[PDB]
């Protein structure tokens, strides 16, 4: 009768233990599911593995240590992977009311954290995570600086503003370098991770970094205990602003071949274990921090920086290189074999559907810099307003283009939350808006109401180009600059704008000098269309000499050549043409005539 | 003359810039935004197993037993993993040959019936 009296007697600890089992075996199934028929099957592993809990916390009356631990991971794989969040609520705030009448302060805050991070998150709306920054600042007021549970709730806070950053951007940070402060003292690896989510947030809302926290980001990767994860996060970080300024990345490349040797092997762990008190660990899931993935995405990041020098058989990095790395993040999705939630094995492969996306997309705009049409169409991509902006490019250079349509194009753009795309969008518009100006024929009002959509638009181009980090981007300081002077002298525009007084004036034209000087000879990235525009704009507005002149001309009528331009290597040639006739330059009068005369054959057809 | 001159190609620099796409201002944020985005952050109390272990004769046990005396007839909702490439095929295992999971464990999955596709769903319109 041994076996009726345990059944009876163990119930409780047996069907505790029966759920772990189906949780074991739910984790061994997931990777593996390919059809509807083994889903259904991992939810029935899953489901019976929550009657199990259920069976345990809705059936007995539990010590509260048990209470903790089962409720606690109860809430846990409901939120994860059911939609019964009202559920988990309850239970955990069944738990939180039990926790009031007992001296266990640390679960306490356990449970608060599930509340005010975990189950906002799984409702899945930006609104649900703005009420929850009320219920944190509550209990960071009752916290001492010196308390690790008030970092995780301004943790929660920081979360809790990053929806809806429009001003909020200065909240956030002024709290994230709140954060850093108190923690600075602390954990080392909290530290880093707080550090690396700061310059992530940064480089997400495109605003400029301070000196000194890339400093602190660097510091990170030195000679310390800090994670290795979490160094090579700190080091992806600092080649991504490197690369959102336009800037040589050489250095950060060796410094990625000194830790990739420096520590090699290191075997890997997708999860980071950071103790923040006795009794409380944060568990940061990192299954791209690690030796073959970095690798993989460092070269895409490597693409990415040279993608502007594919008409270079040098430097054309980005065409070698992309369809590599489109290759591996496939077998990387196919061979993925992690023991995990399906939830969690499906977001490892959406990471490699974003790669494969963005490769697509920039292997697009690639054969759009070197050809009229992409041989084979324009890819869709998950990104949408990528798939918009690939579409204005291409209609954009089309051999008949319909500009009232690259219009509405760009213009979608200059309303979209990503503040780059914005700017990207502004910047095209103003172009077509001062060729409409140019262009015009309509007298003194029509003239005069370009002129003022004109300035309108400039004026909207500036204010959200002064606001960004591009500020120290020199490939798009040199190109404002540039912008600024082809709606305003006559040869450029038609009809030109005048301004008092300006100072304007001083400041983009020392601009204009100081780039054209250093870079006819911290020298830009070398982009075909960027020099062309400064070596065009230079050589008729700042060199005297007609020979030197005549080298500028030719040079810029031949750089038409090596990408497709053919509407600028068009103007480059009549410049040219009228510059080697006042060098009396007999024999390249007429071959640039020649050129000239199939150049316009194949404009027109 | 001038080659092209009374054609309708443009001849200025800024006409000819509206057929120009600024293709060496290349966008790089969603690059960043892959990166940052740590899958998953967690709190979790560092503490002893507060479940005694059962007798290891209990865990040979033939018969099923009744978890969920009552509540799944309010069933509950799983998520279908959106991006999910999923197919229909028979061809793989029945539940309860399914690897590990032990032998009291297959015995209690005798008799359910699998969860509904119906109940399987990205998503809820409350």
Redesign the interface.
């Known amino acids: 009768m041994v076996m009726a009296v345990n059944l009876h007697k163990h119930q409780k600890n047996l069907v505790y233990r029966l759920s772990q089992q189906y949780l074991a075996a739910a984790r061994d199934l997931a990777a593996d599911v390919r059809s509807e028929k083994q889903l259904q099957q991992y939810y029935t592993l899953v489901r019976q593995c929550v009657h199990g809990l259920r069976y345990v916390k809705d059936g007995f009356q539990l010590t509260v240590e048990e209470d903790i631990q089962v409720t606690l991971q109860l809430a846990r794989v409901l939120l994860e992977e059911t939609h019964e969040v009202e559920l988990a609520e309850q239970y955990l705030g069944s738990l939180r009311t039990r926790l009031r009448t007992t001296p266990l302060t640390d679960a306490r805050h356990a449970v608060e954290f599930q509340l005010l991070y975990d189950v906002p998150l799984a409702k899945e709306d930006r609104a649900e995570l703005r009420q929850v920054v009320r219920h944190t600042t509550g209990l960071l007021e009752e916290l001492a600086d010196s308390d690790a549970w008030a970092w995780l709730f301004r943790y929660c806070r920081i979360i809790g503003l990053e929806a809806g950053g429009a001003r909020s951007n200065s909240a956030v940070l002024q709290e994230y370098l709140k954060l850093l402060q108190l923690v600075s003292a602390g954990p080392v690896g909290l530290h880093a991770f707080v550090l690396c989510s700061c310059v992530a947030f940064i480089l997400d809302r495109v605003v400029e970094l301070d000196r000194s926290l890339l400093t602190q980001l660097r510091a990170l990767r030195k000679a310390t205990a800090i994670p290795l994860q979490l160094q090579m996060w700190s080091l992806l970080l600092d080649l991504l602003v490197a690369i959102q300024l336009d800037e040589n990345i050489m250095d950060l490349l060796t410094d990625f071949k000194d830790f990739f040797s420096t520590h090699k092997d290191a075997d890997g762990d997708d999860t980071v274990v950071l103790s923040i008190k006795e009794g409380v660990n944060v568990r940061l899931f990192v299954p791209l921090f690690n030796y073959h993935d970095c690798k993989n995405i460092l070269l895409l990041f490597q693409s990415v920086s040279y993608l502007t020098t594919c008409y270079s058989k040098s430097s054309n990095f980005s065409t070698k290189f992309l369809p590599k790395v489109l290759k591996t993040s496939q077998e990387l999705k196919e061979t993925l074999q992690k023991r995990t939630s399906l939830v969690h094995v499906q977001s490892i492969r959406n990471i490699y559907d974003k790669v494969v996306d963005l490769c697509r997309f920039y292997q697009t705009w690639e054969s759009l810099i070197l050809s009229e049409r992409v041989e084979g169409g324009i890819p869709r991509l998950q990104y949408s307003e990528y798939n918009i902006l690939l579409e204005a490019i291409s209609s954009q250079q089309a051999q008949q283009a319909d500009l009232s349509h690259v219009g509405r194009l760009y213009s979608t753009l200059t309303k979209s939350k990503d503040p780059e795309l914005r700017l990207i969008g502004i910047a095209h518009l103003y172009t077509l808006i001062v060729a409409e100006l140019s262009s015009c024929s309509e007298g003194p009002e029509g003239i005069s109401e370009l002129t003022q959509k004109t300035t309108d638009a400039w004026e909207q181009l500036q204010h959200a180009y002064l606001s960004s980090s591009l500020v120290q981007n020199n490939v798009w300081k040199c190109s404002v600059a540039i912008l600024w002077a082809i709606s305003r002298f006559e040869p450029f525009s038609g009809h030109p704008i005048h301004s008092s007084s300006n100072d304007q004036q001083t400041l983009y034209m020392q601009q204009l000098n100081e780039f054209f000087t250093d870079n006819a000879l911290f020298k830009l990235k070398k982009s075909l269309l960027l020099h062309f525009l400064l070596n065009y704009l230079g050589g008729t507005m700042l060199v005297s000499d007609v020979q030197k002149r005549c080298d500028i001309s030719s040079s810029c009528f031949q750089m038409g050549k090596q990408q497709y331009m053919p509407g600028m290597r068009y103007v480059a040639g009549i410049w040219h043409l009228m510059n080697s006739t006042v060098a009396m330059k007999t024999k390249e009068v007429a071959i640039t005539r020649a050129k000239l005369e199939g150049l316009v054959d194949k404009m027109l057809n | 003359t001038?080659?092209?001159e009374d054609?309708?190609?443009?001849?200025?620099?800024?006409?000819?810039?509206?057929?120009?796409?600024?293709?060496?201002?290349?966008?790089?944020?969603?690059?960043?935004?892959?990166?940052?985005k740590?899958?998953?952050?967690?709190?979790?109390?560092?503490?002893?197993?507060?479940?005694?272990?059962?007798?290891e004769?209990?865990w040979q046990?033939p018969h099923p037993?009744d978890?969920?005396?009552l509540?799944?007839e309010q069933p509950?909702?799983?998520?279908?993993?959106?991006?999910?490439?999923?197919?229909?095929?028979?061809d793989?295992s029945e539940?309860a040959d399914?690897?590990?999971?032990?032998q009291?464990?297959r015995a209690?999955?005798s008799g359910?019936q699998?969860?509904?596709?119906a109940?399987?769903?990205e998503?809820?319109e409350s």
């Open positions: 001038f080659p092209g054609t309708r190609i443009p001849k200025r620099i800024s006409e000819a810039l509206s057929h120009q796409p600024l293709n060496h201002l290349v966008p790089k944020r969603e690059l960043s935004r892959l990166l940052s740590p899958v998953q952050i967690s709190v979790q109390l560092e503490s002893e197993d507060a479940f005694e272990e059962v007798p004769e209990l046990y037993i978890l969920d005396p509540r799944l509950l909702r799983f998520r279908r993993p959106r991006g999910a490439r999923l197919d229909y095929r028979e793989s539940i399914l690897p590990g999971m032990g009291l464990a209690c999955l359910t699998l969860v509904d596709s109940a399987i769903v998503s809820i």
